[PDB]
Design a protein around this motif. Structure first.
Motif, PDB file in Angstrom:
ATOM      1  N   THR A  25       0.850  -1.186   0.000  1.00  0.00           N
ATOM      2  CA  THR A  25       0.000   0.000   0.000  1.00  0.00           C
ATOM      3  C   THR A  25       0.886   1.237   0.000  1.00  0.00           C
ATOM      4  O   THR A  25       2.100   1.163   0.224  1.00  0.00           O
ATOM      5  CB  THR A  25      -0.946   0.089   1.257  1.00  0.00           C
ATOM      6  N   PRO A  26       0.291   2.395  -0.243  1.00  0.00           N
ATOM      7  CA  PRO A  26       1.092   3.614  -0.251  1.00  0.00           C
ATOM      8  C   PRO A  26       1.386   4.104   1.151  1.00  0.00           C
ATOM      9  O   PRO A  26       0.545   3.987   2.035  1.00  0.00           O
ATOM     10  CB  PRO A  26       0.215   4.593  -1.028  1.00  0.00           C
ATOM     11  N   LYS A  27       2.583   4.637   1.356  1.00  0.00           N
ATOM     12  CA  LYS A  27       2.948   5.166   2.655  1.00  0.00           C
ATOM     13  C   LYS A  27       2.661   6.675   2.661  1.00  0.00           C
ATOM     14  O   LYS A  27       3.236   7.429   1.884  1.00  0.00           O
ATOM     15  CB  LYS A  27       4.429   4.888   2.930  1.00  0.00           C
ATOM     16  N   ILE A  28       1.758   7.116   3.526  1.00  0.00           N
ATOM     17  CA  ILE A  28       1.424   8.536   3.604  1.00  0.00           C
ATOM     18  C   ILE A  28       2.435   9.318   4.439  1.00  0.00           C
ATOM     19  O   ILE A  28       2.985   8.796   5.407  1.00  0.00           O
ATOM     20  CB  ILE A  28       0.033   8.746   4.226  1.00  0.00           C
ATOM     21  N   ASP A  29       2.670  10.575   4.074  1.00  0.00           N
ATOM     22  CA  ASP A  29       3.621  11.407   4.804  1.00  0.00           C
ATOM     23  C   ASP A  29       2.851  12.233   5.811  1.00  0.00           C
ATOM     24  O   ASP A  29       3.058  13.432   5.932  1.00  0.00           O
ATOM     25  CB  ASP A  29       4.395  12.308   3.831  1.00  0.00           C
ATOM     26  N   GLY A  30       1.958  11.572   6.536  1.00  0.00           N
ATOM     27  CA  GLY A  30       1.170  12.257   7.537  1.00  0.00           C
ATOM     28  C   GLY A  30       1.640  11.938   8.939  1.00  0.00           C
ATOM     29  O   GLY A  30       2.825  11.699   9.168  1.00  0.00           O
ATOM     30  N   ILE A  31       0.700  11.946   9.878  1.00  0.00           N
ATOM     31  CA  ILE A  31       0.983  11.652  11.275  1.00  0.00           C
ATOM     32  C   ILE A  31       0.166  10.449  11.733  1.00  0.00           C
ATOM     33  O   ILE A  31      -1.058  10.413  11.582  1.00  0.00           O
ATOM     34  CB  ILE A  31       0.656  12.856  12.169  1.00  0.00           C
ATOM     35  N   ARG A  32       0.873   9.470  12.289  1.00  0.00           N
ATOM     36  CA  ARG A  32       0.285   8.228  12.783  1.00  0.00           C
ATOM     37  C   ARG A  32      -0.680   8.504  13.914  1.00  0.00           C
ATOM     38  O   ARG A  32      -0.404   9.328  14.773  1.00  0.00           O
ATOM     39  CB  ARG A  32       1.388   7.297  13.288  1.00  0.00           C
ATOM     40  N   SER A  33      -1.812   7.809  13.906  1.00  0.00           N
ATOM     41  CA  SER A  33      -2.803   7.967  14.956  1.00  0.00           C
ATOM     42  C   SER A  33      -3.702   6.743  15.075  1.00  0.00           C
ATOM     43  O   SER A  33      -4.380   6.357  14.122  1.00  0.00           O
ATOM     44  CB  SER A  33      -3.657   9.204  14.698  1.00  0.00           C
ATOM     45  N   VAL A  34      -3.705   6.131  16.253  1.00  0.00           N
ATOM     46  CA  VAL A  34      -4.533   4.951  16.500  1.00  0.00           C
ATOM     47  C   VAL A  34      -5.716   5.326  17.383  1.00  0.00           C
ATOM     48  O   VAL A  34      -5.603   6.214  18.230  1.00  0.00           O
ATOM     49  CB  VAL A  34      -3.749   3.849  17.234  1.00  0.00           C
ATOM     50  N   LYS A  35      -6.846   4.654  17.189  1.00  0.00           N
ATOM     51  CA  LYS A  35      -8.019   4.927  18.015  1.00  0.00           C
ATOM     52  C   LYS A  35      -8.163   3.945  19.170  1.00  0.00           C
ATOM     53  O   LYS A  35      -8.451   2.758  18.973  1.00  0.00           O
ATOM     54  CB  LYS A  35      -9.314   4.874  17.222  1.00  0.00           C
ATOM     55  N   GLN A  36      -7.982   4.463  20.376  1.00  0.00           N
ATOM     56  CA  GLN A  36      -8.065   3.677  21.596  1.00  0.00           C
ATOM     57  C   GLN A  36      -8.943   4.516  22.509  1.00  0.00           C
ATOM     58  O   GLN A  36      -8.444   5.306  23.312  1.00  0.00           O
ATOM     59  CB  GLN A  36      -6.662   3.521  22.185  1.00  0.00           C
ATOM     60  N   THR A  37     -10.256   4.342  22.376  1.00  0.00           N
ATOM     61  CA  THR A  37     -11.227   5.128  23.138  1.00  0.00           C
ATOM     62  C   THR A  37     -11.240   6.497  22.474  1.00  0.00           C
ATOM     63  O   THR A  37     -12.275   6.970  22.025  1.00  0.00           O
ATOM     64  CB  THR A  37     -10.828   5.262  24.620  1.00  0.00           C
ATOM     65  N   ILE A 135      -9.996   7.479   4.268  1.00  0.00           N
ATOM     66  CA  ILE A 135      -9.518   6.726   3.122  1.00  0.00           C
ATOM     67  C   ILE A 135      -8.969   5.352   3.488  1.00  0.00           C
ATOM     68  O   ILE A 135      -7.896   5.232   4.078  1.00  0.00           O
ATOM     69  CB  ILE A 135      -8.425   7.527   2.380  1.00  0.00           C
ATOM     70  N   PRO A 136      -9.707   4.294   3.144  1.00  0.00           N
ATOM     71  CA  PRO A 136      -9.286   2.921   3.432  1.00  0.00           C
ATOM     72  C   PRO A 136      -8.135   2.496   2.530  1.00  0.00           C
ATOM     73  O   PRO A 136      -8.249   2.545   1.314  1.00  0.00           O
ATOM     74  CB  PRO A 136     -10.539   2.100   3.135  1.00  0.00           C
ATOM     75  N   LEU A 137      -7.026   2.074   3.111  1.00  0.00           N
ATOM     76  CA  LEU A 137      -5.914   1.635   2.295  1.00  0.00           C
ATOM     77  C   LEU A 137      -5.922   0.123   2.120  1.00  0.00           C
ATOM     78  O   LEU A 137      -5.225  -0.598   2.837  1.00  0.00           O
ATOM     79  CB  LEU A 137      -4.592   2.083   2.911  1.00  0.00           C
ATOM     80  N   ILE A 138      -6.717  -0.353   1.166  1.00  0.00           N
ATOM     81  CA  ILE A 138      -6.811  -1.785   0.873  1.00  0.00           C
ATOM     82  C   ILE A 138      -5.562  -2.182   0.101  1.00  0.00           C
ATOM     83  O   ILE A 138      -5.303  -1.658  -0.985  1.00  0.00           O
ATOM     84  CB  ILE A 138      -8.027  -2.085  -0.004  1.00  0.00           C
TER      85      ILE A 138
END
Length: 293
Positions: A25-37, A135-138
């Motif tokens: 998949t493509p690597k975005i030059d953004g900021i990583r963020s996970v949803k935990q609550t 945007i889903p990165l399938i």
DNA sequence: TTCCGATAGTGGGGTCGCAAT
């Protein structure tokens, strides 16, 4: 069923180390963020920008892994749109959803994607929000070096940082994948160049009080107070055909020793180094020293 | 024995928040 610590990819160097078949998949030059609550950062801290945090928390299902990125904007711009404690954020922004941990973090990547695809079918509205564009990165199935290289050309032409290579059955490892593991690999194309050394800077040992962090790893403050000057080189200012910037990584113990030992007789010399063009505001990004002459 | 994962350390660039100027 939560995520102890975010998944981190390993830097791919030799295209030969890639195992096939694999999903990319493509690597975005953004900021990583996970949803935990709520929405957390790579270091599991809460996303400063409440508008985003709050918004994403409503759309994204518990256990979503992805990156926040302002379309079209520069990196420094996106950096601000996320690191600032905005009370009211009207501007648009996207979130590339690339992983999903519903329950067992041992479920094969393909399956985790499936879980992501399914969630969408059930909640189509998420990909339709007026402000936040999810945007889903399938992943795409790559069967050989050729296809991979082809994919790299594609994502790059579309303006992406690089390509993320994963093992189909791979798990959501709570840590940085290893090369051999081949769970998640980062493929970025650096560029070679040369600059002229113009000065040096001493190495500094951070003697600040050692503590723990969100994950339990050694964490030390950065107060200049606890910064003892070592008697070896730490970085070197150089002139890259006009532009000036420092290079402090890529050196080994003995090198740092020598360079500093001959700081005076080293000035003026030409040194090789690699760097990433994308993201560079006024100087090279991720400058890495390679060798002298 | 050699090899390799996990980890502390040290470095770059660049922005936010906050006290001081």
């Amino acid at each position: 069923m939560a995520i102890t610590k975010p998944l981190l990819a390993a830097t791919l160097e030799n295209i030969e180390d890639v195992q096939f078949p694999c999903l990319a998949t493509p690597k975005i030059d953004g900021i990583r963020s996970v949803k935990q609550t709520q929405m957390l950062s790579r270091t599991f801290k809460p996303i400063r920008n409440s508008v985003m945090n709050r918004l994403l928390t409503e759309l994204l299902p518990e256990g979503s892994d992805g990156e926040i990125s302002i379309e079209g904007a520069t990196f420094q711009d996106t950096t601000s749109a996320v690191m600032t404690g905005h009370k009211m954020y009207n501007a648009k922004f996207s979130y590339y959803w690339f992983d999903y941990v519903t329950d067992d973090p041992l479920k094969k990547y393909i399956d985790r994607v499936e879980d992501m695809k399914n969630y969408i079918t059930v909640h189509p509205h998420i990909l339709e929000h007026a402000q936040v564009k999810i945007i889903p990165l399938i992943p795409v199935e790559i069967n050989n070096i050729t296809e991979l290289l082809q994919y790299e050309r594609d994502v790059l032409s579309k303006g992406f940082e690089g390509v993320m290579i994963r093992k189909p059955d791979g798990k959501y490892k709570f840590g940085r994948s290893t090369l051999k593991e081949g769970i998640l690999l980062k493929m970025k194309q650096f560029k070679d160049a040369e600059a002229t050394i113009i000065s040096m800077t001493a190495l500094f040992k951070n003697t600040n009080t050692k503590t723990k962090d969100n994950f339990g790893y050694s964490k030390r403050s950065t107060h200049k107070s606890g910064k003892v000057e070592e008697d070896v080189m730490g970085s070197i200012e150089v002139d890259y055909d006009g532009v000036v910037f420092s290079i402090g990584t890529g050196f080994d113990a003995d090198q740092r020793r020598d360079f500093w030992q001959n700081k005076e007789s080293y000035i003026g010399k030409m040194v090789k180094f690699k760097y990433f063009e994308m993201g560079s505001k006024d100087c090279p990004r991720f400058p890495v020293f390679i060798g002298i002459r």
